[PDB]
Write a protein that binds this DNA or RNA. Sequence first.
RNA 1: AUAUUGGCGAGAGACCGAUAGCGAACAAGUACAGUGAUGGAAAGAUGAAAAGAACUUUGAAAAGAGAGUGAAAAAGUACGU
RNA 2: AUGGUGAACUAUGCCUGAAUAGGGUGAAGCCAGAGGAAACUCUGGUGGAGGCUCGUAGCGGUUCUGACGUGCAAAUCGAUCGUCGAAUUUGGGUAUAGGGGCGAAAGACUAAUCGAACCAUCUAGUAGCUGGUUCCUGCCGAAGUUUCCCUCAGGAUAGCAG
RNA 3: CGUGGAGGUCAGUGACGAAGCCUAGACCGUAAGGUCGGGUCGAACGGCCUCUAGUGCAGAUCUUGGUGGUAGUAGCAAAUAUUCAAAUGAGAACUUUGAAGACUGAAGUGGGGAAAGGUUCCACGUCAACAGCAGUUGGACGUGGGUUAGUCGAUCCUAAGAGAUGGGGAAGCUCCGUUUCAAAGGCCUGAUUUUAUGCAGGCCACCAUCGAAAGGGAAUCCGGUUAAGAUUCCGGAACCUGGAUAUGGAUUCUUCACGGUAACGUAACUGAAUGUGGAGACGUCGGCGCGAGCCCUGGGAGGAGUUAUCUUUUCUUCUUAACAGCUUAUCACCCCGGAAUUGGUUUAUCCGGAGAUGGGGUCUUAUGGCUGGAAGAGGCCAGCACCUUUGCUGGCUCCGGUGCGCUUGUGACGGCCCGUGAAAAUCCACAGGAAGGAAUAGUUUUCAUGCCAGGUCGUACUGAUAACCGCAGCAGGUCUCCAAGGUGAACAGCCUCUAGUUGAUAGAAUAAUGUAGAUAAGGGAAGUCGGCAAAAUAGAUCCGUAACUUCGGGAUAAGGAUUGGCUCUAAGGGUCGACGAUCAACUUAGAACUGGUACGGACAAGGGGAAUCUGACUGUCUAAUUAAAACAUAGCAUUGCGAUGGUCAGAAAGUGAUGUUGACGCAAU
RNA 4: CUCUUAAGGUAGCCAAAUGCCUCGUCAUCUAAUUAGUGACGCGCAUGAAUGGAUUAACGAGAUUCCCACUGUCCCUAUCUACUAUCUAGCGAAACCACAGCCAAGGGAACGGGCUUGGCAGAAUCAGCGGGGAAAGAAGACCCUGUUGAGCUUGACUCUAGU
RNA 5: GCGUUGGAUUGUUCACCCACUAAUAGGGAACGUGAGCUGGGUUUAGACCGUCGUGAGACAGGUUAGUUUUACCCUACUGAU
RNA 6: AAACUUUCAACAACGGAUCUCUUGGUUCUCGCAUCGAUGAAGAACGCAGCGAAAUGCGAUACGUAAUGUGAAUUGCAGAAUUCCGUGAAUCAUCGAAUCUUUGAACGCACAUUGCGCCCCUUGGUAUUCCAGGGGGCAUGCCUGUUUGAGCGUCAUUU
Lengths: 109, 84, 252, 50
Amino acid sequence: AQRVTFRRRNPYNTRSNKIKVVKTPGGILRAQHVKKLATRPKCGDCGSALQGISTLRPRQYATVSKTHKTVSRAYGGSRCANCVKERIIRAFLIEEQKIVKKVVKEQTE
Amino acid sequence: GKGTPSFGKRHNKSHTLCNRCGRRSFHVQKKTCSSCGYPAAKTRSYNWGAKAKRRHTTGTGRMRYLKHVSRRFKNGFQTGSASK
Amino acid sequence: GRVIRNQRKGAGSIFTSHTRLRQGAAKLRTLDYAERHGYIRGIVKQIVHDSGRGAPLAKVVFRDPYKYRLREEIFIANEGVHTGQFIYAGKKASLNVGNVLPLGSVPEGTIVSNVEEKPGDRGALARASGNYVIIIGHNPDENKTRVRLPSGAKKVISSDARGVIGVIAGGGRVDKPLLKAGRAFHKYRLKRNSWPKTRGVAMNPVDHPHGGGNHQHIGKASTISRGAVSGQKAGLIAARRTGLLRGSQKTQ
Amino acid sequence: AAQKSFRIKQKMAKAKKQNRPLPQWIRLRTNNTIRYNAKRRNWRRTKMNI
RNA sequence: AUAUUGGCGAGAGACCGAUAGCGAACAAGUACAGUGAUGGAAAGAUGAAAAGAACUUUGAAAAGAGAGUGAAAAAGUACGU
RNA sequence: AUGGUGAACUAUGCCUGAAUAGGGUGAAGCCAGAGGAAACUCUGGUGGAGGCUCGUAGCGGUUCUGACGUGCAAAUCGAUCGUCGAAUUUGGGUAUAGGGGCGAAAGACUAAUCGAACCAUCUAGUAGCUGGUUCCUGCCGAAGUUUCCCUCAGGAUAGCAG
RNA sequence: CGUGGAGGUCAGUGACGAAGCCUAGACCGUAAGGUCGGGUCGAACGGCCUCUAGUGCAGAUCUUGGUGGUAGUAGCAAAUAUUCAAAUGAGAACUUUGAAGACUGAAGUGGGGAAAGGUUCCACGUCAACAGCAGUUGGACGUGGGUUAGUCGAUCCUAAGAGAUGGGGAAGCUCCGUUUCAAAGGCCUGAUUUUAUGCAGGCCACCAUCGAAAGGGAAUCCGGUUAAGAUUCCGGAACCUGGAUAUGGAUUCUUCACGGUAACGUAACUGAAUGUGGAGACGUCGGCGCGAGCCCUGGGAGGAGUUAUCUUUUCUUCUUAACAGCUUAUCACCCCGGAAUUGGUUUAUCCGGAGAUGGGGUCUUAUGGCUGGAAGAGGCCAGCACCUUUGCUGGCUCCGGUGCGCUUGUGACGGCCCGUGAAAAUCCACAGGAAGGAAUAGUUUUCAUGCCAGGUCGUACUGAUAACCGCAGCAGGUCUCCAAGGUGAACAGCCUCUAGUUGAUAGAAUAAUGUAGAUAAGGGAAGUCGGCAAAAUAGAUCCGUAACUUCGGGAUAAGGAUUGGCUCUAAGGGUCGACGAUCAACUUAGAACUGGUACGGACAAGGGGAAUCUGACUGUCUAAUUAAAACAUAGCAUUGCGAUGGUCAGAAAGUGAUGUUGACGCAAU
RNA sequence: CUCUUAAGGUAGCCAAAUGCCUCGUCAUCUAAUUAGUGACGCGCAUGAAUGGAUUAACGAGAUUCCCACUGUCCCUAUCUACUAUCUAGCGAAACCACAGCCAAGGGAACGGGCUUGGCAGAAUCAGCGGGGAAAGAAGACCCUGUUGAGCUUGACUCUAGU
RNA sequence: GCGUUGGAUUGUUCACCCACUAAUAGGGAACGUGAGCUGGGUUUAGACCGUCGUGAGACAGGUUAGUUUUACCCUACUGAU
RNA sequence: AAACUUUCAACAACGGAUCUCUUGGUUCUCGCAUCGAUGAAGAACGCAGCGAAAUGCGAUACGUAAUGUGAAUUGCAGAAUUCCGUGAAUCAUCGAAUCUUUGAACGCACAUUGCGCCCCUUGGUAUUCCAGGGGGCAUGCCUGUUUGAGCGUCAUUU
Ligand SMILES: [K+]
Ligand SMILES: [K+]
Ligand SMILES: [K+]
Ligand SMILES: [K+]
Ligand SMILES: [K+]
Ligand SMILES: [Mg+2]
Ligand SMILES: [Mg+2]
Ligand SMILES: [Mg+2]
Ligand SMILES: [Mg+2]
Ligand SMILES: [Mg+2]
Ligand SMILES: [Mg+2]
Ligand SMILES: [Mg+2]
Ligand SMILES: [Mg+2]
Ligand SMILES: [Mg+2]
Ligand SMILES: [Mg+2]
Ligand SMILES: [Mg+2]
Ligand SMILES: [Mg+2]
Ligand SMILES: [Mg+2]
Ligand SMILES: [Mg+2]
Ligand SMILES: [Mg+2]
Ligand SMILES: [Mg+2]
Ligand SMILES: [Mg+2]
Ligand SMILES: [Mg+2]
Ligand SMILES: [Mg+2]
Ligand SMILES: [Mg+2]
Ligand SMILES: [Mg+2]
Ligand SMILES: [Mg+2]
Ligand SMILES: [Mg+2]
Ligand SMILES: [Mg+2]
Ligand SMILES: [Mg+2]
Ligand SMILES: [Mg+2]
Ligand SMILES: [Mg+2]
Ligand SMILES: [Mg+2]
Ligand SMILES: [Mg+2]
Ligand SMILES: [Mg+2]
Ligand SMILES: [Mg+2]
Ligand SMILES: [Mg+2]
Ligand SMILES: [Mg+2]
Ligand SMILES: [Mg+2]
Ligand SMILES: [Mg+2]
Ligand SMILES: [Mg+2]
Ligand SMILES: [Mg+2]
Ligand SMILES: [Mg+2]
Ligand SMILES: [Mg+2]
Ligand SMILES: [Mg+2]
Ligand SMILES: [Mg+2]
Ligand SMILES: [Mg+2]
Ligand SMILES: [Mg+2]
Ligand SMILES: [Mg+2]
Ligand SMILES: [Mg+2]
Ligand SMILES: [Mg+2]
Ligand SMILES: [Mg+2]
Ligand SMILES: [Mg+2]
Ligand SMILES: [Mg+2]
Ligand SMILES: [Mg+2]
Ligand SMILES: [Mg+2]
Ligand SMILES: [Mg+2]
Ligand SMILES: [Mg+2]
Ligand SMILES: [Mg+2]
Ligand SMILES: [Mg+2]
Ligand SMILES: [Mg+2]
Ligand SMILES: [Mg+2]
Ligand SMILES: [Mg+2]
Ligand SMILES: [Mg+2]
Ligand SMILES: [Mg+2]
Ligand SMILES: [Mg+2]
Ligand SMILES: [Mg+2]
Ligand SMILES: [Mg+2]
Ligand SMILES: [Mg+2]
Ligand SMILES: [Mg+2]
Ligand SMILES: [Mg+2]
Ligand SMILES: [Mg+2]
Ligand SMILES: [Mg+2]
Ligand SMILES: [Mg+2]
Ligand SMILES: [Mg+2]
Ligand SMILES: [Mg+2]
Ligand SMILES: [Mg+2]
Ligand SMILES: [Mg+2]
Ligand SMILES: [Mg+2]
Ligand SMILES: [Mg+2]
Ligand SMILES: [Mg+2]
Ligand SMILES: [Mg+2]
Ligand SMILES: [Mg+2]
Ligand SMILES: [Mg+2]
Ligand SMILES: [Mg+2]
Ligand SMILES: [Mg+2]
Ligand SMILES: [Mg+2]
Ligand SMILES: [Mg+2]
Ligand SMILES: [Mg+2]
Ligand SMILES: [Mg+2]
Ligand SMILES: [Mg+2]
Ligand SMILES: [Mg+2]
Ligand SMILES: [Mg+2]
Ligand SMILES: [Mg+2]
Ligand SMILES: [Mg+2]
Ligand SMILES: [Mg+2]
Ligand SMILES: [Mg+2]
Ligand SMILES: [Mg+2]
Ligand SMILES: [Mg+2]
Ligand SMILES: [Mg+2]
Ligand SMILES: [Mg+2]
Ligand SMILES: [Zn+2]
Ligand SMILES: [Zn+2]
């Protein structure tokens, strides 16, 4: 079987030196250096992967349109749908409870 | 070990070229030349090292400017021209 | 005629703490106007392991009263503290586990942790896992609070010094035998180069006061005077007594 | 090392340019006490030591 | 007025005459050794002048034998004796 | 003794990387079944734990007290060995420097140097001790004994000699 | 007596030959020595009277240099191995070519790299020296050629750490300290536009810098090309950053979009300060799933081999990059619904009224598929022609299958910790609404297209039984990537394919003694300090397994049987619609037959038992004579200390380690 | 009973890696045992975290016995490869007062030389390990030196720190 | 003149016992014999114990581990020209 | 008797002693005072027609300018001989310049031929981006200038 060599001067099997063995149109086997895989962006509230947001290396996000990096909702590509809904419910209920607490304080005096 | 087998492990330079003296005495990790004392302002020298002082003293180079001071003094540090 | 190991430790060349993986210094909030006069509410976001420390740390996020931003603080998590819990810190905060209170504002018998030795020092006493300080009484005139420390010592502290209600989490840790030199190795790998320990009696005389002799033996009393000098203080320094302890502790 | 600093490459270039025998028209000069290149260096005999 | 193993410019010696005299009379603090601080040599002389041996011959060649130059080749750069 | 140079070897800590076939054994957790009045007990699977184990690559170096011992080699060669998935091995970066470091501790290691490295100077250090001490001839020609000495391998002193 | 030098003198000697040197030639002196003759030689030197000293050598394991006997001696013996012919050449065991025989046997003697070296790379000429034989050859000698980058690295970031400044210490060289007891700052813009500036509205800093060619990181691939360069050159095809930009597209009369219940979708679809979040960004092991490459294999289209005989046969080509469009997952999420007769479900038992199963959807694009790139490339062939450049002209480059396979990537999980397994640069998103925005018209360089530029340094080669270190062309040491077939559990050993090498001074004999490898009748440790050495055992399947025990082990205890080949049999599955069709791979068990009773047939591969001393165990050390009972270890115990502290550093400090610490801790035993 | 101490060695264990006598005594193991094991203990001089006793498992630790096994031996023999050997080429080093036949004598008390005898014939090759009191190193043991150094201690004299 | 042994234990010289035998005599040769071997002991450095010492350390006290180098020269000897 | 060994002589070797040389060293005496932020000493890298070094020099590179002398330099090549001339020379002298990268070393760094900021100017529409050219940006301290801070503090308005 044909054997391959690193294409860069790094001879060590480090995280940044991963290679794949591909066959070229010349009919031979050659190493191709593969970038480290991207990590899905994660919700800032619960930590789950954010649905609908592309998974790219940090600087690749500068080369894609806004549609790839956000979701049409109140917190886009920052918080997940369930965490946004929980934020809505908490905000509304706590403001209502603030109103009732204020009136209770006013009517207990 | 500690002899021929251990001499095979010598592939990391403790010293590199010194910018000031060029002697390959610049300690890589101390960032100091063991010969001329760079980057200290003064040039390293010791009175017990008389041979080293004689190796590095004035006159061991080409004295690009100092070599003409004696002639200029002999001519009185004149400033004009010979005036044919 | 050689510098001994406990003398060499003071230079801090290979004997410094391995602090790379540590979460940061565990401190109470800076004693500010909010804590001095009322209370401030923060939120426990994470309970995280700290390398080299038995007790877990709690990341508590507060609001900055003077600028619009969040201030994350690293408390030592008390047992029962959970993520999403509201922590209240100040003179007017309630007597609940995880709350930070002045020692004078708590009743006698209260169990606190991360107790300040001086007000504003952000926590000095009862910080190790499972450790705690007992409030035993207050001296409202010249305001001072008497406390019992984990060592059993009675201390008089300013009543403005703060502590966290409860016991430090991670208790019972030293009850489990390490069972392995490897487990001791991994324990001290993230604290400091203090392990393993060669016995001084197994060394040569040049290396240690206990070294030498045709049998391994100290040769002279291992109890060393407090007034001895560096290189002599090996063994039991300024020992009041020796031998197996029998009877009751807490001399008075 | 095939990844060398410019300073090292410059010293290498100077050594390459001065790695030559004595010019043959020397040894014809009037007095010419010079017989051969006494400072000749070879990679197999004496290392440059940077 | 005193000092001056450094620097510059001079004049000298009952000193040494290339294993001596400075380490270095010479491309000497050079070549070279050591990671480094440092350590550190050896090495002068053909002849007045290259006139450094045209040419022939043997040999693959180096060279040899001649021839020749030179006061001398019992001076042939492996060079005063 | 003074002032300097070294952690390219090695010792140790740290930082960042990398490397470690194939088998044996078969711990928790889980599933099914059986026995029992109960308390509980048992069986078959599954699973894949351990500073477990056989054993490569590796790391080390037990024995032959083998080879060699003017060597391939100022420590190697062959067989036989210990160990081989964590107190593991290792690259690079970094820190600790001489009465100092570092040491799972042998006075070990700290560049073939260690019960105090290397380099230069003080230094031509001192030596009652060892070795040597360069031409001829002529004349005279001893002593190993007295006394004293931190003296007994030395000196002073008297004696012998010129 | 003799030597170097000095004053005087002999108007001394000398190119018609001074000094020196050689001379079983002569003379004188007892001698130190002196004199003469001869040869060699070429420029100075001597007698006497005195002066002076670095003034006389056989030694000092004396110093420097040179030279012997040993001695043509020891030896040039590890790494399986060389042979024939031709060419070249003066000369060939060693160069070249061809043929043959071999080896490394993918954990290589292969192909690349890191450190290091520095031209060893390549060509031509060439052999005085080196290559411990040789040499026509070479990593040699001489002369030249060669290293081409926006995309690969450095450069940038920070790590352990190093280190100015402000300050403090020190006689001082300098030391501490790295945000500290400091008045440490420029980028946004109203107004200033007597000038977009200083004044002056209004917002932000607990801080230099260095530190990785394996950590983080913007972006490049394929084919071809050289004697030597290639992700760099050439051709083609892309991408990123910075900048400038004009169209188209989009948006706006409801100014800053619409659709979907929703998860969310899109070609766009304003968004300052400030704040928040994410990515960067992370351990190790185990099983399982999937992908890629490799391996194996069927049909077919070509070429090559064998063909006394057999073989629809053996070998070989049949390939598709970065990038782009469409599409494609596990996981996760959303809508309907309310579930016990509990259901779903993994190899591994987790999940469900905090909403399971089920039905229908959404999403991440690792990855795979099709297409473009792109067949025009590359590969394999055929038919012609050839003074050159060699020129062409055609054809085929297709369709599958299989898996506890190997390597690797990845996913969802599970085990483990008193171990929970970096940081920063950088990028993006979100909250917010400052501000600026339309109607004989405004907005939008996160949509498409279009324009320009991307500097500097490195790039050759070796990377080792000859390019590094070890005095050297040294059997030593030196980090890492890829990794075929068989046998076999296997990256073991053995054989082979691709690739590479055939390099170790040779020839002739076959004494002793050796080094290495072996065998041996009968006995079986009687040898020896001692079973040292060697032998015996060994794999797998089945049976069987004691004392003791911390119940985990001991244990492969001990002790037994079998194993080949061949022909069969049985069991264990997938897909499609109790069965039928079809497809597919090994593992186990059994039987018969068979043979010089052989069969883990080479390779590979435990000796076992009964006890005593000792250390619990795993582990560690005297590198280069000691590996152990020594050290360490977990366990146990003691001691000090509550910070104005314990222990320990520093010459001192407004200094430091523990300490990013606080008695379940640190420190000393 | 005394003398006597701070206490007088307790639980354990032992001719033990600790017992002089000592190869202790008894038993077992063997034909035979200074070995091994099990016992005994007035134990020169066992003993309790200077840890005592015992311990499954583990061990390139030390030791005894048994089975198997074998050239360890009886008692040696044979074979292979590479040397050694010879040749072509290449070509060191150690060492060397001068050198090299003995016996006795005497002698610095063990001679190659001296004395007296024996004897004694060129030039050599392969082996060999008696001798050259062979070589390698100014003995490391011992002693001396009014020579050091590492280490220790209420040696003398000081000193950082406190 | 000729022979004077095989073994258990011990590093042993010595000793003792078993056994065969004709006998199991005593000794020397640098207490023959380490460039002949071996290295069990003694007698470097590691380590344990007992006693002693305040200690470093001491112990003809015990125990365990611990590199045995070179001949090619001369002679002698063995053979060979 | 040869060979071999030894001694001597001649010639030839090995080796470099002796002798004679000496642009060197060493010592003594005399005279003088002159390094550097106007960038020293030292270092690196380059420069000649043909040079590896020594020596000299710095991209104006074995050197330019100026002065003096008056015909060379030399190993070869080249040039010239007008050389009765502002003119050879590897001459001497030396007052004008150049003086790469550095170095006390000075924008920040430096195991990097790494990374900025400001002014003028040029090109690419170009105040902003990229590039070329020229000139600058260290620290401590002194005098002065300007702009400031402090209820430290005076006067005035109040
Ligand atoms: K989206
Ligand atoms: K002791
Ligand atoms: K191994
Ligand atoms: K010593
Ligand atoms: K002179
Ligand atoms: Mg050493
Ligand atoms: Mg270093
Ligand atoms: Mg401990
Ligand atoms: Mg210990
Ligand atoms: Mg010890
Ligand atoms: Mg001491
Ligand atoms: Mg003491
Ligand atoms: Mg000991
Ligand atoms: Mg001289
Ligand atoms: Mg001469
Ligand atoms: Mg003559
Ligand atoms: Mg000669
Ligand atoms: Mg290192
Ligand atoms: Mg094992
Ligand atoms: Mg070995
Ligand atoms: Mg041996
Ligand atoms: Mg030998
Ligand atoms: Mg010792
Ligand atoms: Mg003297
Ligand atoms: Mg007389
Ligand atoms: Mg006296
Ligand atoms: Mg004497
Ligand atoms: Mg003289
Ligand atoms: Mg004469
Ligand atoms: Mg003579
Ligand atoms: Mg003459
Ligand atoms: Mg003299
Ligand atoms: Mg002499
Ligand atoms: Mg003499
Ligand atoms: Mg001598
Ligand atoms: Mg000599
Ligand atoms: Mg020979
Ligand atoms: Mg040999
Ligand atoms: Mg061989
Ligand atoms: Mg050959
Ligand atoms: Mg060939
Ligand atoms: Mg093989
Ligand atoms: Mg093979
Ligand atoms: Mg080549
Ligand atoms: Mg040769
Ligand atoms: Mg030759
Ligand atoms: Mg060449
Ligand atoms: Mg890149
Ligand atoms: Mg500093
Ligand atoms: Mg940096
Ligand atoms: Mg990287
Ligand atoms: Mg190439
Ligand atoms: Mg291109
Ligand atoms: Mg739209
Ligand atoms: Mg569902
Ligand atoms: Mg993809
Ligand atoms: Mg791998
Ligand atoms: Mg390359
Ligand atoms: Mg290469
Ligand atoms: Mg390679
Ligand atoms: Mg080398
Ligand atoms: Mg198989
Ligand atoms: Mg037999
Ligand atoms: Mg038999
Ligand atoms: Mg038997
Ligand atoms: Mg026996
Ligand atoms: Mg015997
Ligand atoms: Mg015995
Ligand atoms: Mg054995
Ligand atoms: Mg068995
Ligand atoms: Mg057993
Ligand atoms: Mg052990
Ligand atoms: Mg293990
Ligand atoms: Mg050793
Ligand atoms: Mg050993
Ligand atoms: Mg121990
Ligand atoms: Mg008792
Ligand atoms: Mg006893
Ligand atoms: Mg006993
Ligand atoms: Mg026995
Ligand atoms: Mg005891
Ligand atoms: Mg072990
Ligand atoms: Mg005799
Ligand atoms: Mg006698
Ligand atoms: Mg003799
Ligand atoms: Mg006689
Ligand atoms: Mg011999
Ligand atoms: Mg002998
Ligand atoms: Mg002596
Ligand atoms: Mg001595
Ligand atoms: Mg005396
Ligand atoms: Mg002393
Ligand atoms: Mg004897
Ligand atoms: Mg002998
Ligand atoms: Mg011997
Ligand atoms: Mg003996
Ligand atoms: Mg022994
Ligand atoms: Mg010993
Ligand atoms: Mg005692
Ligand atoms: Mg003794
Ligand atoms: Mg300059
Ligand atoms: Zn969320
Ligand atoms: Zn320097």
